[PDB]
Write a protein that binds this ligand. Structure first.
Ligand SMILES: Cc1cc(NCCc2ccc(Cl)cc2)c2nncn2n1
Ligand code: NA
Ligand SMILES: [Zn+2]
Length: 208
């Protein structure tokens, strides 16, 4: 049921999604090991992901969360990076998209920093990099990220350097506690709490 609609670069919606992508790049403590070395992206395409069944599944769960949290879904737009982007946009987030070994347990992880999500496009730790050149810093190969609508509800705050949310919570927030420039990361434990709104196709750009 999924259809992908291309956004024009002239469309204010393309422009606002690109700006979120570029402006949330940071440097990473791995010196670029996982995601590559870059300060910005070449955005090749932004597509809107339309699936009525998946949207309705999202909004049903969103209303449930809202009603459990004083009518406040605490909805965010966050990035997700995964080698499984094609399954996600066709069948929704589910248990197969969980990061079993994550710092906050087996859940589906999202980031404010697009460059954090970029570290996961080719697998955990960047895997072996692009399939064509086996390069985690490949500047040729097209990469994809999702920019997603995520319901956090009441989020459990973790200060830090398939499972369940903590009792009475709907998500977990990983607050950055040493790296002063890192933005927050978030984990949900139910696939229905996220909708993959935008598919962004890009390259990382080699710094000059
Ligand atoms: C920590 C973390 C993980 C992400 N994706 C994991 C995708 C995945 C899931 C399962 C296997 Cl096996 C490989 C890759 C992610 N995206 N944006 C921010 N994060 N943060
Ligand atoms: Na939960
Ligand atoms: Zn490559």
């Amino acid at each position: 049921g999924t259809i992908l609609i291309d956004l024009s670069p002239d469309d204010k919606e393309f422009q606002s999604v690109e700006e979120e992508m570029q402006s949330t790049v940071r440097e990473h403590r791995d010196g670029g090991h996982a995601g590559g070395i870059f300060n910005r992206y070449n955005i090749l395409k932004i597509q809107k992901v339309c699936n009525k069944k998946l949207w309705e599944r999202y909004t049903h769960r969103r209303k449930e969360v809202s009603e459990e949290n004083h009518n406040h879904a605490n909805e965010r737009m966050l990035f997700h990076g995964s080698p499984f982007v094609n399954a996600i946009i066709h069948k929704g987030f589910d248990e197969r998209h969980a990061y079993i070994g994550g710092m906050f347990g087996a859940g589906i992880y999202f980031a404010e920093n697009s460059s954090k999500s970029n570290q996961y496009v080719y697998g955990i730790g960047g895997g072996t990099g692009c399939p064509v050149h086996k390069d985690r810093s490949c500047y040729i190969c097209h990469r994809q990220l999702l920019f997603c609508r995520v319901t956090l509800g009441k989020s459990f705050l973790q200060f830090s350097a398939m499972a369940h949310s903590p009792p009475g919570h709907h998500s977990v927030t990983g607050r950055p506690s040493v790296n002063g420039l890192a933005l927050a990361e978030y984990v949900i434990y139910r696939g229905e709490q996220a909708y993959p709104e935008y598919l962004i196709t890009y390259q990382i750009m080699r710094p000059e």
